[PDB]
Structure 1
Amino acid sequence: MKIQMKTPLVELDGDEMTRVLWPLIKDKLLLPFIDLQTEYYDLGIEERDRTNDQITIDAAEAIKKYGVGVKNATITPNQDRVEEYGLKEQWKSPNATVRAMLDGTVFRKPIMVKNIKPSVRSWQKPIVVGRHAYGDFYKNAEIFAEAGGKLEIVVTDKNGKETRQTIMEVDEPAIVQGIHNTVASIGHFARACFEYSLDQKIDCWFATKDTISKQYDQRFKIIFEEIFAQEYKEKFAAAGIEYFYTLIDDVVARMMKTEGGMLWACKNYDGDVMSDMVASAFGSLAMMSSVLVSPYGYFEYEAAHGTVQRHYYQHLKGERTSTNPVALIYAWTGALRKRGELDGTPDLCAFCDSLEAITIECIESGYMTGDLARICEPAAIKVLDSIEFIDELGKRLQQLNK
C-alpha cells in the first residue's frame, strides 16, 4: 500500500553473518511492502562492549514498553571472543539478559517443507520444544576454587536467617557452580505449556532428573503435577490430549522412536540442547521458529541458531555464501504478525502469512540454500546463495503486488 504500522517493533540487531543478512531481509522483503516502524537497538558485540552491555538492558526495557521485539543472533563472548574482538570482558549472554527481564517460555518449532524428510525415521509430525526461558545456569554464580575448600550454598533471608548445605569438601583445585529458579516462574512455565498444548491440541511431555535432583528438579515435577491436576486435567480430557511426565534420559529415548506431534516441555538448559537436536533432525537449524512468550504479556521473536561464524569469515574474504536466512525471516514475520494483531492492523498479519507461504513454496519448488539442497528429495533445481534466495522471495512478493 504500503502497509501501515500503529506501534513500533523493537529491533535488536546481532553479529556476524546474521547481522549481514538482516538488512537484506528488510531491504528486499519488508520495506518495499510495509512502512516499517522500529526502535532499533544494536546488540552487536562492539556496541555491547562500547556501552558496557547497557544497550542490552535498554532493548529489553523497550520490549516491555512497546510489547514485541525481534532479535537477531548475537555472540556470547568467551575467552576466544574477547581475544578476537578486543573486548573489555566476557560479557553475559544478551539472550540470558533479555529473557531474565521478560520471563516466559520459548516455543521452538521446526519449519517444515514437503521435500525434506526428517533425520529420525519415525518422525511424521512436528515436535515443539517449550523451553523455560528463566533461570537455572543462565544466571549462574561460579568459583574457580584454586585451593579447594568446603563448598557450599548459603541462603540468607530478609531477616538475616541463614541456611547452608555442603556440596562437597575437597583439598585440591575445584570448580563450583550455583543456580536458582523461582516457584512463580516454574508456575508460569507449566501454565504456558498446558495452554499451548490445549490451543494446538497436542500432548505435553515434561522430564527432569528428580531422582538425583531431589529438591530442585523435583520442585519442577511437583509444580507441573499440581497445576495440571488443579487446573488442566479436565480440559485435557475434554480436548483428548495427555500430560506425560518421565525422567530426562528416558524421554529422549522415547523421542527417538516417537512419530512426534507433541509439545516437549524443557527446563532452560535441556530446551537449548533439544531444540537444536529437533531443528537439525527435521531439516536444518535454520528451519526453526522461536518465540518467547512472557507471563507479563510481552513477546520476543528470534532465530534459535547462532551467528554462522564460518560463513562470516567467508563473507569477509569477499565470498558469496548460501546462508539459510529462513529463521531470520520467520522472526520478522512472527514479530510483525503479533504487532499487527495487537494493533488491529490485519493487513500486516496478512503480509506475514504470505511471506511465510512464499518462503515454503520457493523451497518446495526446488530453489534453496545449500543446507537444504544437501538433503532435499528430489534434487534441487537451483542452490541459491543468500542474496539470490532473498531476491527470489522478493520477486514472488512483487508478482502479487504485495
Structure 2
Amino acid sequence: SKITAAPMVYVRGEEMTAYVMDLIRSRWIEPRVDVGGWETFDLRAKNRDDTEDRVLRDVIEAGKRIKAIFKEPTVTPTADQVKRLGLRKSWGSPNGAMRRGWNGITISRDTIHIDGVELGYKKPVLFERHAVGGEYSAGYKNVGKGKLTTTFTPSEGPDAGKTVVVDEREIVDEEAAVVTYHNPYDNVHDLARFFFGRCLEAKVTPYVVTKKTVFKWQEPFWQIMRTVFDEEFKAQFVAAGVMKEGEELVHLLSDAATMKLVQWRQGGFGMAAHNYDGDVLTDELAQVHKSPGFITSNLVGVHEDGTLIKEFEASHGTVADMDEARLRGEETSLNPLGMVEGLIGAMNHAADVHNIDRDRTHAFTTKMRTVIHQLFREGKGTRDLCGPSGLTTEQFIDAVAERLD
C-alpha cells in the first residue's frame, strides 16, 4: 500500500539542509513511499574529494538514464572550503557538468507561492534562463597593446572551407581584456516550445528579453521565439483567454525588463532571456518576491530519445550559519519549502517520464504542499514568515508529518 516511487536520482549535500532533508525523507516520504527506485548519492564536499568526483560521474550517468533528479544544496569545494573541511584538493561547481551532461536548454526560475501568505508577486511568474552560451564559456586574455583577429571557417554550405574575418581591431590600451564567445541557438527552438507550453498551462503572458537593438547578434533568439509562438502557440493563447485577438508577442529590452520586474507586482507573466541576462534578472526577481529561497532553479535538458531530463534544486545554499547554531544547541527554523518544491518536481517528473504511479504520486506531492501552506496560514510555519511564534525546524517537520495521513 505504499506509493511506488519512479526511478529518480537523489543528490545529498551536507550541513543544515542535509540534516533537514534526512528528517523529511525519514518522517514525510519513506513511511508513505517505497523509495527503492531512488538512486541516492552522497555529494558532501568530503565525498567528492574522497572519490575524486567519481560520485559526480555517477550522478550525471544516473541522470541521463533516469531523467529525473532532485539535488540538495551543496558546498562547492572552493579554496576557502579546502582548509575549512580538511580536504586534499579543490573541485569546481558541478553546474557546468550537469548542463552539458544533460543537454540543458533552460534553468527555470519561477516564483514559489503559498496559499494564504502574500509574497512580493501576487500571481505566479515564470522565467527561463537559457542554460548555455555567452560569456560563461568565453575564451579571453588580459593584454596590452596589439592586434586582435577573429576568423571563422564554415564546414558546410556554399562557403565551406573559406576562412572569413569576423573581427579585427587594434588594442590601444596598456591594460585590456579581449574576449570571444558564442551563443548556440539551435536549442532555442526547444526552449521556445518548452517556455510557451509552460506559460500557456500557467495562463501567464510570455515576454522575450534581449539587448538585440545594440547586441545585434542576439536577433535570432527573438526571431526563433517569435516564429515558434506565431506558428504554434498564439492561437492557443487567444483561445485560452491569456492574450487578446491581434496581440503580438512582446519583446522587452533587458534594461527595460529590470524595471518591469519591480513594477509588475501583480505577477502573472513569463520571461525568457539569454544565460547572463537570466542570471541577473532572476536574482532581481528573487529580491522582489522575497529572497532566493522562494525562486526555483530547475534545469531542463533534452534526452537523445526526445524526452526531457529535469533536475530540481532550491536556490539557497546549505545554510552553514544555521548548522553552526544547531551545533551550539540553539533553536533553528529552516523553511524547507524551496527544497520541498524541488523534491516535488523531481518526484512528479519521475512518475510522469516513466509512467509509474502517476495519480498517487501527484496526489501525495499535492498533499505535502497543501499541508505546508495550511500550516503557514495558521501561523505554524517557520519563523522567517510566521515570526518568533513560528515553529522550529524540527517542530515544523513533526507538524507536517502528523497532518500528511
TM superposition score category, shorter chain reference: 0.7 to 0.9
Distance change in 2, residues 1:55/1:369 (3 Å):
same
User: Which residue is 1:357 aligned to?
Assistant: 370
Q: What is the aligned partner in structure 1 of residue 402 from structure 2?
A: 395
Residue matched to 1:247? 253
- The amino acid across from 1:100 in the alignment is R
Moved more, 163-172 or 128-137: 163-172
What is the CA-CA distance between 1:372 and the residue it aligns to?
1.4
User: What runs of 5+ residues in structure 2 fail to find an aligned partner?
Assistant: 244-248
- Change in Cα spacing, 1:48 to 1:180, as seen in structure 2 (3 Å) is farther
Decide which of 292, 307, 310 is 2:299's aligned counterpart: 292
Partner of 1:307: 318
Counterpart Cα distance in 2 of 1:157 and 1:89: 41
Shift of the 156–186 alpha-carbon distance from structure 1 to 2, 3 Å rule, reads same
Which residue is equivalent to 1:344?
A: 356
In the TM superposition, what is the alpha-carbon distance from 1:104 to its structure 2 partner? 2.5
Secondary structure of 2:91's aligned partner: coil
The answer to whether the aligner puts 1:39 opposite 2:18 as a matched pair is: no
Deviations 1:295-345 (A, max 9, x none): 332221221222223323334444342121111112222212222233331
Structure 1 CA distance, aligned partners of 2:44 and 2:150? 35
Secondary structure of 1:129 counterpart: strand
Distance 1:113 1:56, change over 3 A: same
Partner of 1:377: none
Counterpart-to-counterpart distance in 2, 1:82 and 1:173: 33
> Could you say what secondary structure the match of 2:186 adopts?
helix
Number of the residue aligned with 2:212: 210
Partner Cα separation in structure 2 for residue 203 and residue 49 of structure 1:
45
1:141 to 1:29, Cα distance in 2 relative to 1, 3 A: farther
Partner of 2:22: 23
- The residue number in structure 2 matching 1:230 is 231
Equivalent-residue separation in structure 1 for 2:317 and 2:181 (angstroms):
24
Q: Deviations over 1:57-96 (max 9, x none)?
A: 3212211101211111123354434454456665332123
> In 2 relative to 1, CA 272–116 (structure 1 residues): closer, same or farther, beyond 3 Å?
farther
CA shift at 1:132, angstroms? 1.9
Instruction: Give the 3 Å change call, closer, same or farther, for CA 211–27 of structure 1 in structure 2.
Output: same
* Distance 1:264-1:50 versus aligned 2 partners, 3 A rule: same
TM-score (norm. length: structure 2): 0.84
The aligned runs of 1:1-400 (5 Å cut-off) are 1-5=1-5, 7-37=6-36, 38-85=38-85, 91-102=91-102, 103-119=104-120, 123-143=121-141, 145=142, 150-151=147-148, 153=150, 155=152, 162=163, 163-166=165-168, 169-215=171-217, 217-242=218-243, 243-258=249-264, 259-296=266-303, 297-341=308-352, 342-345=354-357, 346-374=359-387, 382-397=389-404, 400=405
Q: How far did 1:111 drift?
A: 2.5
SS in 2 for 1:109: coil
The AA in structure 1 aligned to 2:232 is E
Letter in 2 for 1:224: M
**Cα contact 1:107–1:128 (8 A) shared by 2:** yes
Q: Please give the alpha-carbon distance, in whole angstroms, between the structure 2 residues aligned to 1:201 and 1:24.
A: 36
Bigger CA drift: 48-57 or 124-133?
48-57
Which secondary structure state, in structure 1, belongs to the residue aligned with residue 28 of structure 2?
A: helix
**Are the equivalent residues in 2 in contact too, given 1:284–1:372 (CA < 8 A)?**
no
Name the CA distance, whole Å, in 2 between partners of 1:115 and 1:56. 40
CA distance in 2, matches of 1:181, 1:156: 17
Partner SS for 2:302: coil
Deviation string, structure 1 residues 7-38 (Cα, Å, up to 9, x no partner):
42111122432222221111121112111131
| 2: CA distance, partners of 1:236 / 1:14 | 41
TM-score (norm 1): 0.85
Partner of 2:246: none
Name the SS for the 1:367 alignment partner. coil
The alpha-carbon deviation at position 368 of structure 1 amounts to 1.9
Offset of 1:210 from its aligned partner? 1.3
Give the whole-Å Cα distance in 2 for the aligned partners of 1:155 and 1:43.
41
Distance 1:354 1:167, change over 3 A: farther
Q: Number of paired residues?
A: 386
| Structure 2 counterpart of 1:239, one-letter code | A
Q: Distance in 2 between matches of 1:160 and 1:86?
A: 52
One-letter amino acid of the structure 2 residue matched with residue 343 of structure 1: N
Q: Which runs of 5+ in 1 are unaligned?
A: 375-379
Whichever residue aligns with residue 392 of structure 2, its letter is D
User: Quick check: 1:288–1:303 contact (8 Å CA) kept in 2?
Assistant: yes
Distance 1:268 1:319, change over 3 A: farther
Measure how far apart 1:290 and its partner are: 4.1
